PDB file of C-alpha atoms in Angstrom:
ATOM      1  CA  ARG A  24      -0.453  -0.090   0.042  1.00  0.00           C
ATOM      2  CA  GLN A  25       1.169   3.208  -1.123  1.00  0.00           C
ATOM      3  CA  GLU A  26       1.118   5.153   2.640  1.00  0.00           C
ATOM      4  CA  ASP A  27       2.993   2.074   3.418  1.00  0.00           C
ATOM      5  CA  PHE A  28       5.728   2.299   0.575  1.00  0.00           C
ATOM      6  CA  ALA A  29       6.270   6.210   1.299  1.00  0.00           C
ATOM      7  CA  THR A  30       6.891   5.541   4.609  1.00  0.00           C
ATOM      8  CA  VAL A  31       9.640   3.058   3.358  1.00  0.00           C
ATOM      9  CA  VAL A  32      11.666   4.628   1.310  1.00  0.00           C
ATOM     10  CA  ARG A  33      11.726   8.108   3.648  1.00  0.00           C
ATOM     11  CA  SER A  34      12.498   5.787   6.420  1.00  0.00           C
ATOM     12  CA  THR A  35      15.567   2.869   4.660  1.00  0.00           C
ATOM     13  CA  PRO A  36      17.437   1.559   1.545  1.00  0.00           C
ATOM     14  CA  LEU A  37      15.697  -0.178  -0.919  1.00  0.00           C
ATOM     15  CA  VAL A  38      16.905  -3.995  -2.094  1.00  0.00           C
ATOM     16  CA  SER A  39      17.323  -4.605  -5.498  1.00  0.00           C
ATOM     17  CA  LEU A  40      19.299  -5.997  -8.955  1.00  0.00           C
ATOM     18  CA  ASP A  41      19.941  -4.258 -12.192  1.00  0.00           C
ATOM     19  CA  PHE A  42      20.509  -6.825 -14.942  1.00  0.00           C
ATOM     20  CA  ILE A  43      23.385  -5.950 -17.526  1.00  0.00           C
ATOM     21  CA  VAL A  44      22.115  -7.814 -20.050  1.00  0.00           C
ATOM     22  CA  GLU A  45      23.614  -7.960 -23.756  1.00  0.00           C
ATOM     23  CA  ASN A  46      22.796  -9.517 -26.986  1.00  0.00           C
ATOM     24  CA  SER A  47      24.218 -11.229 -29.743  1.00  0.00           C
ATOM     25  CA  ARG A  48      25.316  -7.716 -31.130  1.00  0.00           C
ATOM     26  CA  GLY A  49      27.284  -6.318 -28.188  1.00  0.00           C
ATOM     27  CA  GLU A  50      24.805  -4.178 -27.294  1.00  0.00           C
ATOM     28  CA  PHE A  51      23.083  -3.866 -23.896  1.00  0.00           C
ATOM     29  CA  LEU A  52      19.188  -3.444 -23.074  1.00  0.00           C
ATOM     30  CA  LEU A  53      17.353  -0.378 -21.660  1.00  0.00           C
ATOM     31  CA  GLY A  54      14.259   0.513 -20.712  1.00  0.00           C
ATOM     32  CA  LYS A  55      12.368   3.970 -20.421  1.00  0.00           C
ATOM     33  CA  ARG A  56      11.595   4.799 -16.489  1.00  0.00           C
ATOM     34  CA  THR A  57       7.647   5.819 -16.537  1.00  0.00           C
ATOM     35  CA  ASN A  58       8.119   7.450 -13.423  1.00  0.00           C
ATOM     36  CA  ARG A  59       9.666   9.028 -10.621  1.00  0.00           C
ATOM     37  CA  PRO A  60      12.619   8.836  -9.845  1.00  0.00           C
ATOM     38  CA  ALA A  61      14.543   9.468 -12.717  1.00  0.00           C
ATOM     39  CA  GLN A  62      11.390  10.124 -14.694  1.00  0.00           C
ATOM     40  CA  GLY A  63      11.720   9.762 -18.639  1.00  0.00           C
ATOM     41  CA  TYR A  64      15.390   8.778 -18.091  1.00  0.00           C
ATOM     42  CA  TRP A  65      16.301   5.500 -19.501  1.00  0.00           C
ATOM     43  CA  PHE A  66      17.975   2.219 -17.482  1.00  0.00           C
ATOM     44  CA  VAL A  67      19.383  -0.879 -17.308  1.00  0.00           C
ATOM     45  CA  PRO A  68      16.126  -3.474 -16.318  1.00  0.00           C
ATOM     46  CA  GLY A  69      15.390  -4.229 -12.663  1.00  0.00           C
ATOM     47  CA  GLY A  70      13.667  -4.365  -9.391  1.00  0.00           C
ATOM     48  CA  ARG A  71      13.316  -4.500  -5.801  1.00  0.00           C
ATOM     49  CA  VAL A  72      13.373  -7.401  -3.983  1.00  0.00           C
ATOM     50  CA  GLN A  73       9.957  -8.132  -2.375  1.00  0.00           C
ATOM     51  CA  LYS A  74       9.753  -8.700   1.982  1.00  0.00           C
ATOM     52  CA  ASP A  75      10.747 -12.081   2.429  1.00  0.00           C
ATOM     53  CA  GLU A  76      11.764 -12.947  -0.972  1.00  0.00           C
ATOM     54  CA  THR A  77      14.963 -14.492  -2.016  1.00  0.00           C
ATOM     55  CA  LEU A  78      17.574 -13.702  -3.846  1.00  0.00           C
ATOM     56  CA  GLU A  79      17.218 -16.374  -5.958  1.00  0.00           C
ATOM     57  CA  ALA A  80      13.483 -16.228  -6.108  1.00  0.00           C
ATOM     58  CA  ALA A  81      13.312 -12.036  -7.339  1.00  0.00           C
ATOM     59  CA  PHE A  82      16.368 -12.644 -10.001  1.00  0.00           C
ATOM     60  CA  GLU A  83      14.163 -15.386 -11.460  1.00  0.00           C
ATOM     61  CA  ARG A  84      10.644 -13.709 -11.051  1.00  0.00           C
ATOM     62  CA  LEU A  85      12.630 -10.404 -12.144  1.00  0.00           C
ATOM     63  CA  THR A  86      14.217 -11.919 -15.216  1.00  0.00           C
ATOM     64  CA  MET A  87      10.610 -13.127 -16.427  1.00  0.00           C
ATOM     65  CA  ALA A  88       9.032  -9.705 -15.754  1.00  0.00           C
ATOM     66  CA  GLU A  89      11.182  -7.436 -17.350  1.00  0.00           C
ATOM     67  CA  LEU A  90      12.676  -9.095 -19.676  1.00  0.00           C
ATOM     68  CA  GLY A  91      10.176 -11.978 -20.654  1.00  0.00           C
ATOM     69  CA  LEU A  92      12.828 -14.579 -19.880  1.00  0.00           C
ATOM     70  CA  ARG A  93      12.942 -16.414 -16.758  1.00  0.00           C
ATOM     71  CA  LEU A  94      16.671 -16.808 -15.765  1.00  0.00           C
ATOM     72  CA  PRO A  95      17.954 -18.685 -12.601  1.00  0.00           C
ATOM     73  CA  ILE A  96      20.843 -16.677 -10.519  1.00  0.00           C
ATOM     74  CA  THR A  97      23.003 -18.658 -11.483  1.00  0.00           C
ATOM     75  CA  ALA A  98      23.147 -17.514 -15.224  1.00  0.00           C
ATOM     76  CA  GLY A  99      23.887 -14.155 -13.743  1.00  0.00           C
ATOM     77  CA  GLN A 100      27.066 -13.293 -13.167  1.00  0.00           C
ATOM     78  CA  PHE A 101      27.681 -11.078  -9.761  1.00  0.00           C
ATOM     79  CA  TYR A 102      28.577  -7.567 -11.155  1.00  0.00           C
ATOM     80  CA  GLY A 103      28.758  -6.040  -7.907  1.00  0.00           C
ATOM     81  CA  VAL A 104      26.980  -3.808  -4.736  1.00  0.00           C
ATOM     82  CA  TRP A 105      25.945  -0.795  -6.214  1.00  0.00           C
ATOM     83  CA  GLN A 106      24.208   2.337  -4.433  1.00  0.00           C
ATOM     84  CA  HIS A 107      21.916   4.826  -6.034  1.00  0.00           C
ATOM     85  CA  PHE A 108      20.780   8.093  -4.531  1.00  0.00           C
ATOM     86  CA  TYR A 109      17.955  10.038  -6.151  1.00  0.00           C
ATOM     87  CA  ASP A 110      16.829  13.503  -4.624  1.00  0.00           C
ATOM     88  CA  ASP A 111      12.791  12.304  -5.569  1.00  0.00           C
ATOM     89  CA  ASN A 112      10.621   9.726  -4.828  1.00  0.00           C
ATOM     90  CA  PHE A 113       7.320   7.870  -6.673  1.00  0.00           C
ATOM     91  CA  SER A 114       5.303  10.425  -5.216  1.00  0.00           C
ATOM     92  CA  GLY A 115       6.997  13.369  -5.654  1.00  0.00           C
ATOM     93  CA  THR A 116       9.841  15.639  -4.388  1.00  0.00           C
ATOM     94  CA  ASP A 117       9.333  15.754  -0.346  1.00  0.00           C
ATOM     95  CA  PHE A 118      11.751  13.035   0.206  1.00  0.00           C
ATOM     96  CA  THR A 119      14.419  11.258  -1.210  1.00  0.00           C
ATOM     97  CA  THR A 120      15.622   7.552  -2.492  1.00  0.00           C
ATOM     98  CA  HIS A 121      18.070   5.790  -1.417  1.00  0.00           C
ATOM     99  CA  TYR A 122      18.930   2.095  -3.693  1.00  0.00           C
ATOM    100  CA  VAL A 123      21.190  -0.571  -2.530  1.00  0.00           C
ATOM    101  CA  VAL A 124      22.041  -2.724  -6.098  1.00  0.00           C
ATOM    102  CA  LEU A 125      23.225  -6.189  -6.602  1.00  0.00           C
ATOM    103  CA  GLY A 126      23.906  -6.137  -9.928  1.00  0.00           C
ATOM    104  CA  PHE A 127      23.792  -9.036 -12.646  1.00  0.00           C
ATOM    105  CA  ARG A 128      25.542  -9.577 -15.946  1.00  0.00           C
ATOM    106  CA  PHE A 129      24.756 -12.243 -18.246  1.00  0.00           C
ATOM    107  CA  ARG A 130      24.458 -12.440 -22.005  1.00  0.00           C
ATOM    108  CA  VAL A 131      21.258 -13.342 -24.122  1.00  0.00           C
ATOM    109  CA  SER A 132      19.950 -13.586 -27.619  1.00  0.00           C
ATOM    110  CA  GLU A 133      17.631 -10.745 -28.264  1.00  0.00           C
ATOM    111  CA  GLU A 134      15.269 -12.828 -30.545  1.00  0.00           C
ATOM    112  CA  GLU A 135      13.978 -15.044 -27.312  1.00  0.00           C
ATOM    113  CA  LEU A 136      12.518 -12.242 -25.011  1.00  0.00           C
ATOM    114  CA  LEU A 137       9.248 -11.246 -23.929  1.00  0.00           C
ATOM    115  CA  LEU A 138       9.299  -7.749 -24.233  1.00  0.00           C
ATOM    116  CA  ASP A 139       9.401   1.058 -24.638  1.00  0.00           C
ATOM    117  CA  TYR A 140      12.725  -0.996 -23.950  1.00  0.00           C
ATOM    118  CA  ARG A 141      16.021  -0.456 -26.580  1.00  0.00           C
ATOM    119  CA  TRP A 142      19.235  -1.677 -27.403  1.00  0.00           C
ATOM    120  CA  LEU A 143      22.276   0.254 -26.893  1.00  0.00           C
ATOM    121  CA  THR A 144      26.414  -0.316 -27.402  1.00  0.00           C
ATOM    122  CA  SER A 145      28.611   0.373 -24.976  1.00  0.00           C
ATOM    123  CA  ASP A 146      29.935   3.619 -26.858  1.00  0.00           C
ATOM    124  CA  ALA A 147      26.249   4.868 -28.449  1.00  0.00           C
ATOM    125  CA  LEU A 148      25.048   4.253 -23.994  1.00  0.00           C
ATOM    126  CA  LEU A 149      28.074   6.238 -22.489  1.00  0.00           C
ATOM    127  CA  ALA A 150      26.716   9.248 -24.690  1.00  0.00           C
ATOM    128  CA  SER A 151      23.796   9.454 -24.547  1.00  0.00           C
ATOM    129  CA  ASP A 152      22.456  11.994 -22.244  1.00  0.00           C
ATOM    130  CA  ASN A 153      18.792  10.324 -22.166  1.00  0.00           C
ATOM    131  CA  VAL A 154      20.560   7.306 -20.363  1.00  0.00           C
ATOM    132  CA  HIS A 155      20.606   8.150 -16.677  1.00  0.00           C
ATOM    133  CA  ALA A 156      23.871   8.320 -14.407  1.00  0.00           C
ATOM    134  CA  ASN A 157      23.579   5.289 -12.765  1.00  0.00           C
ATOM    135  CA  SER A 158      23.140   3.153 -15.929  1.00  0.00           C
ATOM    136  CA  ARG A 159      26.216   4.579 -17.698  1.00  0.00           C
ATOM    137  CA  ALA A 160      28.151   3.794 -14.301  1.00  0.00           C
ATOM    138  CA  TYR A 161      27.936  -0.004 -14.926  1.00  0.00           C
ATOM    139  CA  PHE A 162      30.002   0.402 -18.231  1.00  0.00           C
ATOM    140  CA  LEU A 163      32.433   2.937 -16.476  1.00  0.00           C
ATOM    141  CA  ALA A 164      36.221   1.791 -15.291  1.00  0.00           C
ATOM    142  CA  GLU A 165      36.444   4.626 -12.462  1.00  0.00           C
ATOM    143  CA  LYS A 166      32.789   3.541 -11.364  1.00  0.00           C
ATOM    144  CA  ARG A 167      34.367   0.336 -10.762  1.00  0.00           C
ATOM    145  CA  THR A 168      36.261   0.931  -8.537  1.00  0.00           C
ATOM    146  CA  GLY A 169      35.595   0.054  -4.878  1.00  0.00           C
ATOM    147  CA  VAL A 170      32.719  -1.618  -5.115  1.00  0.00           C
ATOM    148  CA  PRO A 171      32.687  -4.277  -3.314  1.00  0.00           C
ATOM    149  CA  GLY A 172      32.311  -7.615  -5.607  1.00  0.00           C
ATOM    150  CA  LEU A 173      34.211  -6.212  -8.044  1.00  0.00           C
TER     151      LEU A 173
ATOM    152  CA  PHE B   6      15.948   9.131  13.202  1.00  0.00           C
ATOM    153  CA  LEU B   7      12.858   6.711  12.577  1.00  0.00           C
ATOM    154  CA  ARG B   8      10.024   6.577  15.362  1.00  0.00           C
ATOM    155  CA  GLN B   9       8.614   3.033  16.440  1.00  0.00           C
ATOM    156  CA  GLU B  10       5.654   2.926  14.045  1.00  0.00           C
ATOM    157  CA  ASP B  11       7.732   3.834  11.110  1.00  0.00           C
ATOM    158  CA  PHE B  12      10.444   1.455  11.820  1.00  0.00           C
ATOM    159  CA  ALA B  13       7.952  -1.491  12.516  1.00  0.00           C
ATOM    160  CA  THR B  14       6.047  -0.384   8.788  1.00  0.00           C
ATOM    161  CA  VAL B  15      10.125  -0.512   7.734  1.00  0.00           C
ATOM    162  CA  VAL B  16      10.874  -4.065   9.173  1.00  0.00           C
ATOM    163  CA  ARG B  17       7.026  -5.572   7.768  1.00  0.00           C
ATOM    164  CA  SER B  18       7.580  -4.047   4.253  1.00  0.00           C
ATOM    165  CA  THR B  19      10.783  -4.720   2.957  1.00  0.00           C
ATOM    166  CA  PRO B  20      14.286  -6.133   3.798  1.00  0.00           C
ATOM    167  CA  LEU B  21      17.314  -4.338   5.790  1.00  0.00           C
ATOM    168  CA  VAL B  22      20.144  -3.994   4.555  1.00  0.00           C
ATOM    169  CA  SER B  23      23.302  -4.965   6.954  1.00  0.00           C
ATOM    170  CA  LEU B  24      26.746  -5.429   7.020  1.00  0.00           C
ATOM    171  CA  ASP B  25      28.383  -8.330   9.105  1.00  0.00           C
ATOM    172  CA  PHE B  26      31.939  -9.059  10.680  1.00  0.00           C
ATOM    173  CA  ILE B  27      33.644 -12.208  10.497  1.00  0.00           C
ATOM    174  CA  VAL B  28      36.333 -10.893  12.402  1.00  0.00           C
ATOM    175  CA  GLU B  29      40.194 -12.809  13.001  1.00  0.00           C
ATOM    176  CA  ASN B  30      42.179 -12.624  16.198  1.00  0.00           C
ATOM    177  CA  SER B  31      45.713 -14.070  16.285  1.00  0.00           C
ATOM    178  CA  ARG B  32      44.905 -17.265  17.665  1.00  0.00           C
ATOM    179  CA  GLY B  33      42.503 -17.865  14.518  1.00  0.00           C
ATOM    180  CA  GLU B  34      39.052 -17.611  16.814  1.00  0.00           C
ATOM    181  CA  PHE B  35      36.270 -15.324  15.393  1.00  0.00           C
ATOM    182  CA  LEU B  36      33.967 -12.772  17.290  1.00  0.00           C
ATOM    183  CA  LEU B  37      30.496 -13.430  18.304  1.00  0.00           C
ATOM    184  CA  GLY B  38      27.731 -11.842  20.580  1.00  0.00           C
ATOM    185  CA  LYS B  39      25.256 -12.632  22.260  1.00  0.00           C
ATOM    186  CA  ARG B  40      21.826 -10.853  21.302  1.00  0.00           C
ATOM    187  CA  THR B  41      20.246  -9.522  24.562  1.00  0.00           C
ATOM    188  CA  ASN B  42      16.925  -9.161  22.119  1.00  0.00           C
ATOM    189  CA  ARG B  43      14.834  -9.438  19.614  1.00  0.00           C
ATOM    190  CA  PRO B  44      15.120 -11.138  16.714  1.00  0.00           C
ATOM    191  CA  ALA B  45      17.005 -14.283  17.791  1.00  0.00           C
ATOM    192  CA  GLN B  46      17.194 -13.156  21.345  1.00  0.00           C
ATOM    193  CA  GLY B  47      19.750 -15.304  23.560  1.00  0.00           C
ATOM    194  CA  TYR B  48      21.395 -16.823  20.166  1.00  0.00           C
ATOM    195  CA  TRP B  49      25.399 -16.025  19.464  1.00  0.00           C
ATOM    196  CA  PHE B  50      26.219 -13.665  16.296  1.00  0.00           C
ATOM    197  CA  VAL B  51      28.923 -11.958  14.270  1.00  0.00           C
ATOM    198  CA  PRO B  52      28.884  -8.299  15.085  1.00  0.00           C
ATOM    199  CA  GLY B  53      27.311  -6.153  12.393  1.00  0.00           C
ATOM    200  CA  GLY B  54      24.321  -3.520  12.372  1.00  0.00           C
ATOM    201  CA  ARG B  55      22.092  -2.511   9.519  1.00  0.00           C
ATOM    202  CA  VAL B  56      22.613   0.040   6.711  1.00  0.00           C
ATOM    203  CA  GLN B  57      20.653   3.571   7.490  1.00  0.00           C
ATOM    204  CA  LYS B  58      18.800   5.899   4.391  1.00  0.00           C
ATOM    205  CA  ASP B  59      21.366   7.753   2.416  1.00  0.00           C
ATOM    206  CA  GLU B  60      24.502   6.539   4.043  1.00  0.00           C
ATOM    207  CA  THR B  61      26.696   4.805   2.053  1.00  0.00           C
ATOM    208  CA  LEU B  62      28.466   1.586   2.675  1.00  0.00           C
ATOM    209  CA  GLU B  63      31.391   3.057   3.240  1.00  0.00           C
ATOM    210  CA  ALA B  64      30.499   5.502   5.815  1.00  0.00           C
ATOM    211  CA  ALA B  65      28.125   2.323   7.669  1.00  0.00           C
ATOM    212  CA  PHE B  66      31.597   0.154   7.315  1.00  0.00           C
ATOM    213  CA  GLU B  67      33.278   2.677   9.302  1.00  0.00           C
ATOM    214  CA  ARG B  68      30.545   4.082  11.710  1.00  0.00           C
ATOM    215  CA  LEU B  69      29.640   0.200  12.593  1.00  0.00           C
ATOM    216  CA  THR B  70      33.203  -0.917  13.043  1.00  0.00           C
ATOM    217  CA  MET B  71      33.806   1.965  15.509  1.00  0.00           C
ATOM    218  CA  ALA B  72      30.195   1.083  17.460  1.00  0.00           C
ATOM    219  CA  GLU B  73      30.339  -2.797  17.407  1.00  0.00           C
ATOM    220  CA  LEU B  74      34.329  -3.388  17.622  1.00  0.00           C
ATOM    221  CA  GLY B  75      35.546  -0.139  19.226  1.00  0.00           C
ATOM    222  CA  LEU B  76      37.037   0.678  16.610  1.00  0.00           C
ATOM    223  CA  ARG B  77      37.272   2.633  13.554  1.00  0.00           C
ATOM    224  CA  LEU B  78      37.856   1.107   9.749  1.00  0.00           C
ATOM    225  CA  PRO B  79      37.784   2.496   6.758  1.00  0.00           C
ATOM    226  CA  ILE B  80      35.821  -0.540   4.139  1.00  0.00           C
ATOM    227  CA  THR B  81      39.247  -0.955   2.390  1.00  0.00           C
ATOM    228  CA  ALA B  82      40.190  -2.998   5.199  1.00  0.00           C
ATOM    229  CA  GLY B  83      37.446  -5.465   4.605  1.00  0.00           C
ATOM    230  CA  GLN B  84      37.329  -8.724   2.045  1.00  0.00           C
ATOM    231  CA  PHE B  85      34.013  -8.648   0.540  1.00  0.00           C
ATOM    232  CA  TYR B  86      32.957 -12.109   1.597  1.00  0.00           C
ATOM    233  CA  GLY B  87      29.539 -11.929  -0.895  1.00  0.00           C
ATOM    234  CA  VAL B  88      25.525 -11.229  -0.552  1.00  0.00           C
ATOM    235  CA  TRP B  89      23.929 -13.156   2.270  1.00  0.00           C
ATOM    236  CA  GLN B  90      19.888 -13.389   3.307  1.00  0.00           C
ATOM    237  CA  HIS B  91      18.595 -13.588   6.757  1.00  0.00           C
ATOM    238  CA  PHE B  92      14.944 -14.452   7.756  1.00  0.00           C
ATOM    239  CA  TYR B  93      13.552 -14.185  11.190  1.00  0.00           C
ATOM    240  CA  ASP B  94      10.330 -15.637  12.330  1.00  0.00           C
ATOM    241  CA  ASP B  95       9.987 -12.507  14.942  1.00  0.00           C
ATOM    242  CA  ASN B  96      10.997  -8.723  15.158  1.00  0.00           C
ATOM    243  CA  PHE B  97      12.369  -6.205  17.218  1.00  0.00           C
ATOM    244  CA  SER B  98       8.886  -5.483  18.995  1.00  0.00           C
ATOM    245  CA  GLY B  99       7.400  -8.868  19.395  1.00  0.00           C
ATOM    246  CA  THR B 100       6.287 -12.115  17.184  1.00  0.00           C
ATOM    247  CA  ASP B 101       3.487 -10.227  15.227  1.00  0.00           C
ATOM    248  CA  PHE B 102       5.452 -10.282  11.824  1.00  0.00           C
ATOM    249  CA  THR B 103       9.143 -11.356  10.249  1.00  0.00           C
ATOM    250  CA  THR B 104      12.385  -9.702   9.670  1.00  0.00           C
ATOM    251  CA  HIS B 105      14.471 -10.043   6.110  1.00  0.00           C
ATOM    252  CA  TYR B 106      17.729  -8.943   6.095  1.00  0.00           C
ATOM    253  CA  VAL B 107      20.268  -9.047   2.903  1.00  0.00           C
ATOM    254  CA  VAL B 108      23.351  -8.901   4.136  1.00  0.00           C
ATOM    255  CA  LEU B 109      27.180  -8.067   3.215  1.00  0.00           C
ATOM    256  CA  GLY B 110      29.509  -9.969   4.773  1.00  0.00           C
ATOM    257  CA  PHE B 111      33.424  -8.882   5.089  1.00  0.00           C
ATOM    258  CA  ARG B 112      36.318 -10.194   6.493  1.00  0.00           C
ATOM    259  CA  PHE B 113      39.683  -9.174   8.655  1.00  0.00           C
ATOM    260  CA  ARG B 114      41.545 -10.194  11.016  1.00  0.00           C
ATOM    261  CA  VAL B 115      42.144  -7.832  14.239  1.00  0.00           C
ATOM    262  CA  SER B 116      44.450  -7.123  17.318  1.00  0.00           C
ATOM    263  CA  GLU B 117      42.294  -8.888  20.160  1.00  0.00           C
ATOM    264  CA  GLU B 118      43.451  -6.467  22.793  1.00  0.00           C
ATOM    265  CA  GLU B 119      42.832  -3.741  20.140  1.00  0.00           C
ATOM    266  CA  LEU B 120      38.855  -3.989  20.732  1.00  0.00           C
ATOM    267  CA  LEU B 121      36.933  -1.753  22.978  1.00  0.00           C
ATOM    268  CA  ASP B 122      28.461 -10.377  26.030  1.00  0.00           C
ATOM    269  CA  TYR B 123      31.233 -11.652  23.401  1.00  0.00           C
ATOM    270  CA  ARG B 124      33.298 -14.990  22.624  1.00  0.00           C
ATOM    271  CA  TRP B 125      36.519 -15.892  20.662  1.00  0.00           C
ATOM    272  CA  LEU B 126      35.337 -19.431  18.962  1.00  0.00           C
ATOM    273  CA  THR B 127      37.257 -21.177  16.422  1.00  0.00           C
ATOM    274  CA  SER B 128      34.766 -22.253  13.701  1.00  0.00           C
ATOM    275  CA  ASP B 129      34.852 -25.714  14.993  1.00  0.00           C
ATOM    276  CA  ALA B 130      33.982 -24.057  18.423  1.00  0.00           C
ATOM    277  CA  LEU B 131      31.313 -22.122  17.197  1.00  0.00           C
ATOM    278  CA  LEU B 132      29.957 -24.663  14.247  1.00  0.00           C
ATOM    279  CA  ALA B 133      29.153 -27.243  17.391  1.00  0.00           C
ATOM    280  CA  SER B 134      27.892 -25.141  19.034  1.00  0.00           C
ATOM    281  CA  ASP B 135      23.663 -24.908  19.906  1.00  0.00           C
ATOM    282  CA  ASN B 136      24.204 -21.141  20.756  1.00  0.00           C
ATOM    283  CA  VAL B 137      25.556 -19.982  18.040  1.00  0.00           C
ATOM    284  CA  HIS B 138      22.665 -19.005  15.387  1.00  0.00           C
ATOM    285  CA  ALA B 139      22.787 -21.007  11.788  1.00  0.00           C
ATOM    286  CA  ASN B 140      23.054 -17.137   9.996  1.00  0.00           C
ATOM    287  CA  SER B 141      26.333 -17.115  11.985  1.00  0.00           C
ATOM    288  CA  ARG B 142      27.279 -20.433  11.130  1.00  0.00           C
ATOM    289  CA  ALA B 143      26.270 -20.308   7.958  1.00  0.00           C
ATOM    290  CA  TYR B 144      29.308 -18.035   6.812  1.00  0.00           C
ATOM    291  CA  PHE B 145      32.148 -21.452   8.293  1.00  0.00           C
ATOM    292  CA  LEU B 146      30.118 -23.502   6.256  1.00  0.00           C
ATOM    293  CA  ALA B 147      31.101 -24.794   2.923  1.00  0.00           C
ATOM    294  CA  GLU B 148      27.677 -26.098   1.477  1.00  0.00           C
ATOM    295  CA  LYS B 149      26.848 -22.533   2.226  1.00  0.00           C
ATOM    296  CA  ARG B 150      29.681 -20.322   0.930  1.00  0.00           C
ATOM    297  CA  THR B 151      27.993 -22.336  -2.754  1.00  0.00           C
ATOM    298  CA  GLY B 152      25.633 -19.884  -4.898  1.00  0.00           C
ATOM    299  CA  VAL B 153      26.483 -16.986  -2.465  1.00  0.00           C
ATOM    300  CA  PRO B 154      27.118 -14.050  -4.991  1.00  0.00           C
ATOM    301  CA  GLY B 155      30.307 -11.952  -4.706  1.00  0.00           C
ATOM    302  CA  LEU B 156      31.934 -15.182  -3.122  1.00  0.00           C
TER     303      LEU B 156
END
């Protein structure tokens, strides 16, 4: 419920999984964020881990939901623990959002997905101002340094 | 800072984020502390604590190593030891709802006499103990390190 989720966001870091998904063309999958935080920006697919949900089950649920292809956690290469801080939140601009993010990287076949979404090369996404800094960071050497698990 | 009612809502609705410290001394023994409040009251756990809103992992590590161990250590002193998950059938305020932690483990070695109840236990001791909680024993079991992200 929304009154409670507002309280959650105001009060504590959310836990999420982010997916660095590569196709056969060396491009990476991005999705447009329709709502706050970082509204209108393009982001790697992912989502938050639910109360009492295992990382294994979250991974399977989120790949299915976000990619249209259910993968197990063992299919993903762990890509470190990341931290995202936004000045706004899903409900507006009264409080900040804080994500603690488990990144995973894997390679897929474009054709085998139930998917707006776009495929961008490393170079194109890094030069794209419509892709959020928090997603471009995954592809920057300077940002990977000091990330637990990398 | 959070009021009782809001932290209850938090614990009820979402996973908490914590750092757990696997702290080794000179003798190859590991630091464990007795929990005196819920959840899992009475069991012995590695030191640690939850990451707070808008706090970086780096700042949390420094704050928690000082709070828990009496020695302020930077995150760089710790060996990242995987992402774990701890589920408790109770919570800080009773048995009406569960607690869920997503845990970042960190391993490091200390001089025992330099730190500020507690016990130093070998892995063989802690693993054979019925008072050391399963969530803490898992760090020292081979079957448990399989499939842990970051290990």
